[PDB]
Design a protein around this ligand. Structure first.
Ligand SMILES: OC[C@H]1O[C@H](O[C@@H]2[C@@H](O[C@@H]3[C@H](O)[C@@H](O)O[C@H](CO)[C@H]3O)O[C@H](CO)[C@@H](O)[C@@H]2O)[C@@H](O)[C@@H](O)[C@@H]1O
Ligand SMILES: [Ca+2]
Ligand SMILES: [Ca+2]
Lengths: 227, 213
């Protein structure tokens, strides 16, 4: 019955301002029991209250973030805006907007009873950059061997990796990317294959990065040592 | 200032409680609400004004509050209850709303599983760019918490380490990566490098050497 949706940039650069917009449905911000709140959550961390704006334009802003935040509303168009100044890499987070309802006249009874799906905002200085692709090879006396491809220093997400143009799916594990303090991503894809056929099979990682119009193929060769 | 345990466990069918420890300034005097957030999903209101359920929330969830602590209780625990649970309360000293740190609830079932650890040395290609990334890939472990330590020759390596949070695989076990970022000169100044993974008081480690053969 009630829905909200966050609009705004997927990325923002350090020291720049972030401006998010919440559109909502199934209730009116004119109702005297109603407010709209902005909540954020860094990846893997806790929920944090940012700012709420009430039907009568009372505001409740996180005192820790007061000097950076502003919030406003356009009730006739069901829109609520949040701005946050001087962005920092620690501000990378999923930003949710929600409906708050409370008891009129009551004492901080407020609850967030409805939630938007949330917008992941990444704070990074990076421009679009295609990955450097490096082969990962091993040690080969056990039955299988793990070969892989380091997909290094790209922006933004996502990247796709296949092996042998899709002809090889078994034993493929592509690991989630890490966002480095540089503001660039890296991930690794590995394929576990029979050791016996390392000299009989060719293994090529196919790496696609659509934002940078980048397509790289890289053959992964075993490093052999003299007997 | 709102304190929740980071982690709680229970068996399917059992009752578990998640507590949020506060002070007079928050839980003591103000309404507690509770939120459930499935992995990767959106938070959802479960309890408001300490002990009320919104409609469409199961009666398996209940809330209470005594003194400066509050509790969420969950009966008939089901696998789909695996989530991060948060308490929320206004705080009149803070003059602001505070969330608990979140308690991740695990539903017991799958047996313990130790990690597979794969360690790669820098490639020749990267070394020619005066760079050297050691890649430690960690997979197939359960539960999904590991600690990663790097060693160079004998000693501990702190500088240049970056490790991902554990993620779910298609086979219902967990994966993580850790990267040790060096220069080629750094790489070549030590004779061995190790990635050591600790899982449930047990250690798995891998070793690479700049002298390949
Ligand atoms: O003040 C805490 C209260 O804030 C939110 O409700 C506000 C509140 O407005 C107060 C009140 O109207 C008046 O006494 O002083 C100011 C001007 O209105 C204002 O700060 O109370 C009214 C009525 O309850 C609400 O309409 C306002 O939106 C909610 O968060 C309450 O839960 C909270 O206790
Ligand atoms: Ca020999
Ligand atoms: Ca109670």
């Amino acid at each position: 019955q009630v829905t909200l949706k966050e609009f705004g940039p997927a990325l923002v650069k350090p020291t720049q301002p972030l401006t998010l917009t919440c559109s909502f449905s199934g209730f009116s911000l004119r109702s005297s029991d109603t407010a709209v709140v902005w909540i954020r959550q860094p990846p893997g961390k806790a929920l944090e209250w940012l700012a709420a704006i009430y039907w009568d334009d009372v505001e409740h802003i996180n005192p820790s973030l007061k000097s950076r935040l502003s919030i406003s509303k356009d009730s006739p168009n069901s829109l609520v805006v949040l701005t946050m100044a001087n962005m920092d890499p620690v501000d990378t987070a999923t930003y949710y907007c929600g409906r708050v309802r409370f008891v009129s006249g009551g004492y901080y009874t407020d609850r967030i009873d409805s939630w938007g799906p949330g917008l992941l905002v990444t704070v990074s200085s990076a421009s679009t950059k295609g990955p450097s692709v490096f082969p990962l090879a091993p040690s080969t006396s056990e039955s299988t061997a793990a070969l892989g491809c380091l997909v290094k220093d790209y922006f933004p997400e996502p990247v796709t990796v296949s092996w042998n143009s899709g002809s090889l799916t078994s034993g493929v594990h592509t690991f989630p990317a890490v966002l480095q303090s540089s503001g660039l991503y890296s991930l690794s894809s590995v394929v576990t294959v029979p050791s016996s056929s390392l000299g009989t099979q060719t293994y090529v990682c196919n790496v696609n990065h659509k934002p940078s119009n980048t397509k790289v193929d890289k053959r992964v060769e075993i490093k052999t040592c003299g007997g | 200032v709102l304190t929740q345990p980071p982690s709680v466990s229970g068996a399917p069918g059992q009752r578990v409680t998640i507590s949020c420890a506060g002070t007079k300034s928050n839980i003591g005097d103000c309404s507690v609400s509770w939120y459930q957030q499935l992995p990767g999903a959106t938070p959802r209101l479960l309890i408001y004004q300490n002990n009320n359920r919104p409609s469409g929330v199961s009666d398996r969830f209940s809330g209470s509050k005594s003194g400066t602590s509050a509790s969420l209780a969950i009966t008939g625990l089901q696998t789909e209850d695996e989530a991060d649970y948060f308490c929320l309360s206004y705080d009149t000293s803070f003059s602001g709303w505070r969330f608990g740190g979140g308690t991740r609830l695990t539903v017991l079932g799958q047996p313990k599983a130790s990690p597979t650890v794969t360690l790669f040395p820098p490639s020749s290609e990267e070394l020619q760019a005066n760079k050297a990334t050691l890649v430690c890939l960690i997979s197939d472990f359960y539960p999904g918490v590991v600690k990663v330590a790097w060693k160079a020759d004998g000693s501990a390596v702190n500088a240049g380490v970056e490790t991902t949070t554990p993620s779910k695989q298609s086979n219902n076990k967990y994966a993580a990566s850790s990267y040790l970022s060096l220069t080629s000169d750094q790489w070549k100044s030590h004779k061995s490098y190790s990635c050591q993974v600790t899982h449930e008081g047990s250690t798995v480690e891998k070793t690479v050497a700049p002298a390949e053969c």
